[PDB]
Ligand code: HEM
């Protein structure tokens with residue numbers, strides 16, 4: 001029931017992109033979109049998430065090597081500072 | 084106030100040390116005046132400055 | 139006794155550790171420190187105090203014995 | 212690579228103060244190492260400046276220290292810093308010893324032996340520094356303890372005539388004691404480095420007694436700023452002592468020129484020797500009393516060799532803990548009885564307190580340990 | 590900058606990374622930015638702007654550290670915090 | 679016998695139950711204790727060091743556990759004792775063989 005509810009809510013109207021790259025025709029691509037994806041007839045998220053900044057550590061000495069990562073909060077997408 | 088203060092005086096070490104030395108001299112001056120005023124204030128009377136002011 | 143790397147062999151442990159700027163300077167000082175120090179005080183009353191009241195009783199006893207010896211003559 | 216891991220002095224700095232795996236369980240009762248070290252270097256500085264204005268002679272010492280406290284700028288507070296810093300050093304030394312006995316860290320054997328030798332050296336340095344101001348109290352106490360060293364049959368008479376330089380405490384004795392108090396804290400610092408060497412061989416101790424090798428936090432910057440906190444607490448207590456009540460510790464008779472005839476009736480050593488002195492005058496035997504003092508320090512040697520428990524500390528042995536607190540009260544009892552004139556009820560309770568001291572530390576510790584032992588299905 | 594050019598060019602070879610790039614560009618932006626604008630913004634880069642941005646996103650942050658395994662040698666979090674900002678050594 | 683009640687009073691007044699510890703935790707370490715700890719299965723060893731590190735944290739911060747998680751006199755799963763018996767008996771075996 002929750003699976004049907006999830007599939008019915010989190011997919012439908014604005015939030016989907018068909019993309020085609022390679023040896024085809026864009027006109028016939030939109031024609032096939034008209035042929036099949038038309039009539040889908042669909043009809044409230046993205047809050048700022050608080051970055052904590054902390055340290056988790058798994059002392060687990062059975063394995064030979066060691067794996068250490070360290071990160072900070074990344075800026076995102078709308079900045080050339082990302083470049 | 085706090086954001087301005089951190090964005091100015093807490094990102095270069097040598098400028099931080101210089102401004103705390105300058106503020107340390109200013110605070111030393113202000114503490115001289117305050118401590119001397121208080122200690123002369125709670126023991127008025129029997130102090131040598133007024134007995135010299137007699138003469 | 140040596141440096142790190144060779145001391146113990148422990149699996150099965152995950153430690154969470156919080157940033158110092160994340161949390162407060164004084165997290166619930168008065169609502170915790172007073173009952174904790176009351177518990178640490180009650181945990182040592184009959185072990186620490188009964189030597190000192192023996193000290194004060196022998197103090198007053200020997201003192202008043204000296205006074206009684208030095209006030210009849 | 213890393214400058215700290217390449218330079219040979221910086222390798223010593225890294226192994227001493229940075230990469231030392233420390234127990235995360237230790238409260239303010241483990242700050243005493245930094246406290247004693249900062250007390251030691253401040254004693255070095257104060258005694259150094261005093262020696263820049265002190266005259267080691269019987270005629271000139273009293274007048275010269277008077278010239279220091281009245282004429283040389285801040286010499287009055289530097290003298291007060293030296294004496295009261297000796298007292299604060301003694302407080303921290305006793306509580307360092309009390310931690311080392313309470314938390315079972317005395318199982319470290321040779322480290323305990325190095326500490327015993329350090330205790331000898333600090334006692335000798337303290338006594339000769341107290342002799343130096345050429346006071347009435349210092350003169351008579353030096354005469355008494357010199358005769359205590361003459362208690363030894365057939366060796367002590369030649370040894371005391373060897374340390375005199377005369378018949379009594381004269382200028383030779385004064386200058387020799389100046390030399391020994393003037394040289395000894397360097398040797399104290401060297402044996403302190405040896406003390407630190409054997410501890411960093413072993414590793415430090417937590418309140419539980421279980422080794423904290425799974426929970427080692429570094430020595431820096433946690434314990435560095437915690438020792439700074441404890442050190443500035445020592446600074447404020449010591450400096451408020453030297454600037455508010457300088458006379459709560461110092462004897463009144465210490466400000467008198469030495470009279471070679473008087474023997475004032477409240478003659479006593481200072482309070483950090485009165486428990487050493489209360490054992491003496493409550494035993495009617497000269498050699499017996501000084502042997503009782505030497506055997507008290509040898510009991511402090513012995514107590515690592517009688518840990519017949521199965522825990523390390525007395526943290527979970529409350530009976531031995533209560534006996535330890537009775538010993539704390541008995542130590543302060545002996546110190547106060549050392550601070551009293553010779554009186555008959557005081558004589559009775561001083562003898563009872565000294566024999567109680569011996570019976571608690573010698574006899575009652577394995578008895579309490581074996582009751583705690585056999586009580587726990589062992 | 591030449592490494593970033595060559596990495597992006599060899600990244601977008603074939604058809605799967607190209608179509609993935611189109612999908613991810615039109616999800617984050619609603620539109621696709623071709624690589625010539627990326628080349629112009631590469632030409633918009635000198636070391637001064639780089640150290641400004643690295644001063645923005647590194648200089649005394651509160652990072653997230655994850656350790657996995659025999660990580661006894663891994664220092665405490667305050668060692669990372671001390672070695673994070675230079676005091677110019 | 680009432681000595682069991684005396685042991686109950688002692689185990690109340692000890693505090694490692696309040697810290698949530700067993701009897702096989704606070705043994706003083708000689709090398710025989712080291713051998714006895716080395717002669718243990720992996721699961722009990724890891725549970726023991728987990729208990730030790732939780733106890734060291736709750737001893738540093740001193741915020742000691744609620745009443746409910748405290749171990750009791752009955753459920754004290756003491757296990758190091760027969761291993762300690764075997765280690766000390768091998769040590770007495772070696773001492774007797776040298777003094778024979
Ligand atoms: C002469 C003065 C002394 C100095 C400067 C000194 C110095 C130190 C230092 C720096 C430490 C390491 C940090 C600490 O826990 O305090 C230490 C630890 C220790 N000292 Fe001393 N010490 C002195 C006297 C003594 C004496 C008289 C004893 C007793 C024999 C002693 C026994 C110990 C023990 C057992 C430890 C380790 C305690 C632990 O692991 O927590 N020390 N000392």
Ligand code: HEM
Pocket residue numbers: 251254255257258259261262265276290293294296297298300336337340341342343344392393394395396397
């Ligand atoms: C090598 C360094 C030291 C030097 C050069 C030194 C020098 C002196 C001098 C010249 C005096 C006589 C002046 C006076 O009494 O104010 C003195 C007294 C004294 N010193 Fe030191 N001293 C040193 C270290 C220590 C240490 C480490 C202690 C013990 C903590 C100590 C304890 C005392 C005491 C108790 C007195 C008697 C204080 C008084 O009666 O006024 N000294 N010292």
